[PDB]
Amino acid sequence: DRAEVRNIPFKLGMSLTVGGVVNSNATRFSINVGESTDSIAMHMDHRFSYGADQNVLVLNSLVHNVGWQQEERSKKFPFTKGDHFQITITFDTHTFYIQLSNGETVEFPNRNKDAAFNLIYLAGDARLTFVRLE
Amino acid sequence: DRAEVRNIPFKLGMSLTVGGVVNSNATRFSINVGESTDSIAMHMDHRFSYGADQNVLVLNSLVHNVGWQQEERSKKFPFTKGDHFQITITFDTHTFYIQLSNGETVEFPNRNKDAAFNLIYLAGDARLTFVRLE
Numbered sequence: 036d037r038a039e040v041r042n043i044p045f046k047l048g049m050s051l052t053v054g055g056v057v058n059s060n061a062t063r064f065s066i067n068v069g070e071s072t073d074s075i076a077m078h079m080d081h082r083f084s085y086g087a088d089q090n091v092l093v094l095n096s097l098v099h100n101v102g103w104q105q106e107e108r109s110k111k112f113p114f115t116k117g118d119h120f121q122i123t124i125t126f127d128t129h130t131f132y133i134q135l136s137n138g139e140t141v142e143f144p145n146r147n148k149d150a151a152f153n154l155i156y157l158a159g160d161a162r163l164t165f166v167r168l169e
Numbered sequence: 170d171r172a173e174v175r176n177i178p179f180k181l182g183m184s185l186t187v188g189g190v191v192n193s194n195a196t197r198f199s200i201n202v203g204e205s206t207d208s209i210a211m212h213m214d215h216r217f218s219y220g221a222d223q224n225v226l227v228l229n230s231l232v233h234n235v236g237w238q239q240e241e242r243s244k245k246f247p248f249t250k251g252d253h254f255q256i257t258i259t260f261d262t263h264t265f266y267i268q269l270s271n272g273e274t275v276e277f278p279n280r281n282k283d284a285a286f287n288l289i290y291l292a293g294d295a296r297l298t299f300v301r302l303e
Contacts, residue, residue: 038177039173039176040173040177041175042297043173043298054281163177165303166174166300168261
């Protein structure tokens with residue numbers, strides 16, 4: 036179902052570039068970097084329409100058998116249903132560095148101080164079209 | 170366990186470059202392009218020591234609930250246990266075009282005439298370190 040890259044270590048000093056296409060009537064889709072679908076160190080949720088959330092990015096971490104931690108939000112939203120997007124992520128032990136399709140960036144804490152991640156995945160209303168992890 | 174890229178379509182005209190490291194005491198490891206672990210359109214097996222097979226590449230397809238089809242072999246074997254390797258694959262409807270770490274190439278028939286593949290994986294005695302699928 037989901038698009039994923041599994042067990043190709045995403046390590047300090049590497050870059051992850053993902054391209055895809057948002058579905059036409061998307062509600063929301065996320066990129067996730069972590070360990071599993073129940074262990075995500077960087078979740079970035081792209082909310083076209085979700086409760087009160089319209090055109091907002093919501094970022095958070097997910098701890099296995101615990102739940103979502105503190106959410107962070109950004110109003111930067113260079114994303115269009117039906118359209119291509121491209122995201123690039125790098126990280127060091129303190130921070131995830133996220134660059135969006137228009138070159139705008141968001142940063143999110145590396146809460147575990149992890150130096151590598153074995154799972155990258157997209158979920159929700161979109162699809163991936165290319166990946167560079169290197 | 171295995172390293173994989175799943176549901177990022179590997180389509181006609183795209184290129185797949187994978188880099189990794191062969192384990193030190195490897196027997197064999199494969200790169201696979203297909204549909205699932207029981208449906209592989211291009212299997213390329215890297216046999217350091219396997220029966221009578223030493224330093225040989227064995228290529229084949231795997232049909233779901235049927236089995237392996239006709240094997241093809243190459244004596245091109247620019248691969249060292251413990252060492253990095255890089256492989257690039259492209260394909261059109263008739264052929265898979267495989268380039269090895271030293272620039273040597275092998276070709277293998279696209280037996281199904283498939284135009285896209287949702288699963289790429291490495292199995293056996295090695296690990297992946299980067300991937301470009303684009």
